[PDB]
Amino acid sequence: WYARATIAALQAAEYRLAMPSASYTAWFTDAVSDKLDKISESLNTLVECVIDKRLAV
Amino acid sequence: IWYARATIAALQAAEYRLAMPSASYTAWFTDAVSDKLDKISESLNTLVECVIDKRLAVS
Amino acid sequence: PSEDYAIWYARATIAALQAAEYRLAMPSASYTAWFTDAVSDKLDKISESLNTLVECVIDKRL
Amino acid sequence: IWYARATIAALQAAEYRLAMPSASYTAWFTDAVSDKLDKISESLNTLVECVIDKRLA
Amino acid sequence: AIWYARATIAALQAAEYRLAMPSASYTAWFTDAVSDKLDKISESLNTLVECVIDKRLAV
């Protein structure tokens, strides 16, 4: 009965995420955020090169 | 005693439905993902409008 | 309940919670709607901008 | 009796290690994220193709 | 039974949940789902940048 009522309780509820641990954010940074930084930098380089091709004498 | 073994069992058997995250998580997530996507999107708009229209993309 | 019960419960519950792993269900509608605004819609705009770029680059080779 | 107060404190004292998500989650996440990454990736590679092809010709 | 469901669910929804380092099982899935595609996108973008710069700097 306990295993069932607990599972029923766990699946009935909703879960609000707090701030993640320092360990999670370190993992997420390498998995996602650092890559986004590099993609932003690469893209801004490309934009600036294209703009400079339009503006250069 | 037995309360630890059956509880782990219940926890692993269950599935967990995320609610809206806390203001704290969302503010972290906005910095780690959403704000960067905005800058990337705005940069690609700039690229496109310069290449296509020879004008500056504006927000 | 006694303090000794309280301590056992806290230690047993925390140990069980950290021993287990958590399989995510379909998120609630509030989460998926938030995530769509936070992430998915921005990826769509990025994707659409690239499609316009590709279309124009390919076309100029007319 | 004293259960929900002690339970809340335990739930918030622990940290949570995510497992492989359910099939419903991954099916959802694929539509919400990964399918769009694939489309973005495909469009970038087409752009690389064109710029390379012009270089070779 | 009624009370247990009631107070346990009340507690679960009142608490907030701090993510640990995810399991290797989750990161393996998330790598396929996200991080590998981010890698590929970055590599293509970098190739595009380098070739547009290469043509600018050529001869």
Numbering used by the authors:
A (entry chain C): 9 to 65
B (entry chain A): 8 to 66
C (entry chain E): 2 to 63
D (entry chain B): 8 to 64
E (entry chain D): 7 to 65
Direct quotes from the study:
Orsay, the only virus known to naturally infect the nematode Caenorhabditis elegans, expresses a capsid-δ fusion protein. By analogy with other viral capsid-associated fiber proteins, the Orsay CP-δ likely functions in cell entry as a cell receptor binding protein.
Among these four constructs, only δ(1–66), which contains the first 66 residues of δ, produced crystals diffracted to better than 3-Å resolution. This five-helical bundle is ~80-Å long and ~35-Å wide. The longer α-helix, consisting of residues 30 to 63, has a kink at around residue 40.
